[PDB]
Design an enzyme around this catalytic site. Structure first.
Site, mmCIF file in Angstrom:
data_model
loop_
_atom_site.group_PDB
_atom_site.id
_atom_site.type_symbol
_atom_site.label_atom_id
_atom_site.label_comp_id
_atom_site.label_asym_id
_atom_site.label_seq_id
_atom_site.Cartn_x
_atom_site.Cartn_y
_atom_site.Cartn_z
ATOM 1 N N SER A 267 0.810 -10.031 -5.930
ATOM 2 C CA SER A 267 0.092 -8.969 -5.237
ATOM 3 C C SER A 267 -0.249 -7.820 -6.173
ATOM 4 O O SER A 267 -1.391 -7.350 -6.203
ATOM 5 C CB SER A 267 0.918 -8.473 -4.056
ATOM 6 N N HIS A 295 0.941 -14.730 -0.130
ATOM 7 C CA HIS A 295 -0.352 -14.071 -0.250
ATOM 8 C C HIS A 295 -1.531 -15.032 -0.302
ATOM 9 O O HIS A 295 -2.670 -14.590 -0.137
ATOM 10 C CB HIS A 295 -0.377 -13.192 -1.500
ATOM 11 N N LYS A 327 1.391 -11.937 6.385
ATOM 12 C CA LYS A 327 0.183 -11.495 5.705
ATOM 13 C C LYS A 327 -1.081 -11.911 6.447
ATOM 14 O O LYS A 327 -1.817 -11.057 6.948
ATOM 15 C CB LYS A 327 0.166 -12.036 4.276
#
Ligand SMILES: CCCCCCCC/C=C\CCCCCCCC(=O)O[C@@H](COC(=O)CCCCCCCCCCCCCCC)COP(=O)([O-])OCC[N+](C)(C)C
Lengths: 492, 153, 44, 77
Positions: A267, A295, A327
């Site tokens: 990230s 992610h 997420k």
């Protein structure tokens, strides 16, 4: 291994002048922090800190003062950027409650006014599933009315439900692996299932940028941990060679196992793991693979199966496929997918399976509806449009920021855009100025990152439209002119 | 910010000396200290150089060998509350480009100040005792040893 | 150059001895290619 | 066999080969030493009738393993 499509990534170097000015600023902050500590210790200036009770004054001090140095002297000054409360669904526009401090961020008081319509670049909803009104919300409401909120027991005991089995089979179909198991927390997934797979006498090879959950899970198990450089397959290959050859340090015996912990998208750095080369190395040297896809499970891929679909690889090559529903899917949770034997072994020997409460029923309903929408079982074209819009927004935002002269990290495909500020005061300045112009961003500092590299991360979404992105880009250009944040030599 | 948000190192401190531009900043800091000293009217050039060497060595001793621990809370559960910064550097690897540079520069400053001090005896003994004070801890033999129990705890 | 040589000649002998041993120390450091780990362990 | 010297020289190589260890006394006959040499095994000599030396050599041989790549010995003779 080879790449079917080009692999573009750029990590520009810090200009030397900016590095020198960075160190000037940090030195000034350190000196004034030492002065402030000297003033506070001699009671010349009253300290705005809570103190231990009189009954326990003769006990050993609970904290070490030097450890809190950076918290009082540097973090407190710019504390207003973080912990911003919200009072709305974290969509493309969010409502932030306003707070004011009259003692330099030591204490905060909430004024009545609330900021409305802030452009949201801090939340993690990649596919824009965070809606208070929708089909997913209606299904979740129905299951909340039926099953209630939360379960009061453990999976191995009476706490197992049918909804959990339905979710597990749906996840197994989604990823393409044989079996999968679901957990009530993404952090707990790693922290509680890395110890089960690997124990004393085995080796764990970790990236430089692994999440805190992966590092904690590695620590809890007794395995030896060796850290290779970020996306440096030369380092990984050398470590594998030396580990296989020399063996254990004290008594040179073969390792029982070798496990490689990696992530799909990092990230903060913004980079995507070189999966084909990692798979080639693990096949050559007979090492197992643990792939964290928090992610990348929703953002990446032509349809959204993750990094393995993005590269076009085979899911059967990855030994353990971790993932998180927070997420992309918009509901809290976690999962691990793999072979049926692995999943049964986890069902019997996972810490959270035995001791920790299972997931809430409305959350699993929300996950089921979102995942069915993504794979298109309902038949609505919302599945493809969200992914296509995310890709278009990512490419447009990254290109137009690179053509303004900023420094940006990571691949061209990753939907996280870390802009680089490089100076301690510019962190707070950027945060405050962006909030003043109705844009919410996330900024990080020295203890989190390398000292020279301080950044602000943007998390793009499929909910952001062209108008929203254009407004954000013009505001970013104005701020960058104001703070002089365009350090790019290649572009102006 | 919290330690570990954007990197997996338990102790970022150990690498602050290997960062980019840190050496040039250190050299420019020594030069700025020298110029600030030259700014004093009544002080003479040889005692300017003696003061430069003494102040540099004092500050470097205070930071590298006196203060122990980490300014920020670290998730390794206190490896280095007892270790000083020099011991922390590079996880205890005894030689490194950073360590070599840090231990070489005081000797270069000593040669320069010996040249400019006109080789006087008083200045020689002051500068040499200061140089010994700095250079004695740098020896690999003196790693994690406290003489007469000073700064152990 | 010449003035530096004369100034060095004007200095005592112990000072030049110390400067020589220090430049030898610098050479030893700069050529100390070995990188020890500084760890002690033995089998139980 | 038709010769006592040939017995050792010709049958020690058959029993033991490369990767094995041979522990010899200080006073072994020339036939035993030649037979040990002909086979590729590593030869280590302990002192004459010193069971402390034999015990120490056995311990170190089992623990540390082969010199170049510390692997278990196939055999110890
Ligand atoms: C070991 C301690 C190392 C202290 C180094 C001091 C460096 C800072 C310095 O020289 O100037 C500081 C004094 O500094 C002080 O007066 C602070 C003295 C130590 C305070 C200790 C507080 C905890 C008790 C002041 O620096 P300035 O002029 O504000 O810039």
């Amino acid at each position: 291994g080879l790449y079917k499509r080009p692999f573009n990534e750029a990590f520009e170097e810090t200009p030397m002048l900016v590095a020198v000015l960075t160190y000037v600023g940090y030195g000034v902050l350190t000196l004034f922090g030492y002065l402030r500590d000297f003033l506070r210790y001699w009671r010349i200036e009253k300290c705005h800190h809570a103190t231990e009770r009189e009954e326990q004054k003769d006990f050993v001090s609970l904290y070490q003062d030097f450890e809190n140095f950076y918290t009082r002297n540097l973090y407190m000054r710019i504390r207003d950027n973080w912990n911003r409360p919200i009072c709305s669904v974290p969509g493309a526009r969010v409502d932030i409650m306003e707070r004011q401090s009259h003692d330099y961020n030591w204490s905060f008081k909430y004024t009545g006014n609330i900021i409305k319509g802030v452009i949201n670049m801090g939340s993690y909803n990649y596919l824009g599933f965070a809606r208070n009104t929708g089909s997913c919300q209606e299904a979740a409401a129905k299951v909340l009315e039926e099953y209630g909120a939360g379960v009061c027991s453990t999976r191995q005991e009476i706490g197992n439900l049918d909804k959990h089995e339905e979710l597990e089979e749906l996840v197994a179909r989604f990823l393409g692996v044989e079996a999968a198991m679901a957990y009530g927390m993404g952090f707990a997934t790693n922290s509680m299932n890395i110890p089960a797979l690997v124990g004393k006498g085995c080796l764990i090879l970790s990236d430089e940028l692994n999440h805190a959950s992966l590092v904690l899970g590695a620590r809890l198990s007794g395995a030896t941990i060796r850290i290779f450089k970020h996306n440096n397959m030369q380092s990984l290959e050398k470590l594998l060679k030396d580990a296989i050859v020399y063996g254990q340090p004290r008594t040179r015996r073969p390792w029982k196992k070798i496990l490689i912990l990696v992530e799909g998208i990092y990230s903060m750095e913004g980079s995507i793991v070189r999966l084909p080369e990692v798979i080639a190395l693990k096949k050559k040297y007979k090492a197992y693979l643990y792939l964290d896809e928090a992610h990348s499970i929703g953002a990446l891929g032509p349809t959204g199966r993750g990094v393995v679909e993005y590269f076009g690889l085979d899911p059967e090559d990855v030994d353990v496929m971790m993932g998180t529903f927070t997420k992309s899917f918009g509901a809290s949770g976690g999962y691990i997918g793999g072979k049926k034997e692995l999943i049964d072994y986890l069902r019997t020997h996972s810490h959270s399976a035995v001791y920790a409460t299972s997931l809430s029923p409305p959350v699993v309903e929300q996950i089921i509806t979102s995942m069915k929408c993504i794979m298109g079982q309902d038949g609505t074209s919302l599945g493809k449009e969200c992914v296509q819009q995310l890709a278009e927004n990512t490419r447009y935002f990254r290109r137009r920021l690179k053509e303004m002269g900023f420094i940006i990290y990571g691949n061209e495909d990753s939907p996280v855009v870390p802009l680089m500020l490089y100076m301690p005061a510019k962190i707070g300045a950027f945060g405050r100025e962006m909030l003043k112009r109705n844009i919410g961003v996330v900024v990080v500092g020295f203890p989190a990152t390398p000292i020279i590299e301080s950044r602000a991360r943007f998390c793009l979404s499929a909910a952001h439209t062209k108008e929203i992105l254009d407004t954000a880009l013009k505001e970013i250009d104005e701020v960058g002119d104001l703070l002089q944040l365009k350090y790019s030599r290649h572009r102006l | 910010m919290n330690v570990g948000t954007a990197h997996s190192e338990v102790n970022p401190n150990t690498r602050v000396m290997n960062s980019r531009g840190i050496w040039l900043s250190y050299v420019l800091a020594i030069g700025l200290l020298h110029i600030v000293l030259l700014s004093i009217p009544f002080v003479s050039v040889p005692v300017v150089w003696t003061l430069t060497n003494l102040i540099h060595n004092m500050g470097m001793y205070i930071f590298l060998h006196t203060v122990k621990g980490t300014p920020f809370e670290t998730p390794d559960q206190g490896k280095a509350r007892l270790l000083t910064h020099w011991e922390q550097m590079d996880y205890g690897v005894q030689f490194t480009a950073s360590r070599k540079f840090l231990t070489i520069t005081p000797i270069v400053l000593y040669f320069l100040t010996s040249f400019y001090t006109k080789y006087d005896q008083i200045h020689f003994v002051l500068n040499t005792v200061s140089l010994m004070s700095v250079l004695i801890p740098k020896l690999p033999q003196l790693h994690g040893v406290r003489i007469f129990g000073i700064n152990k705890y | 150059l010449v003035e530096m040589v004369q100034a060095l000649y004007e200095a005592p002998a112990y000072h030049l001895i110390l400067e020589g041993i220090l430049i030898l120390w610098i050479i030893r450091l700069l050529f100390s290619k070995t990188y020890k780990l500084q760890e002690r362990s033995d089998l139980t």
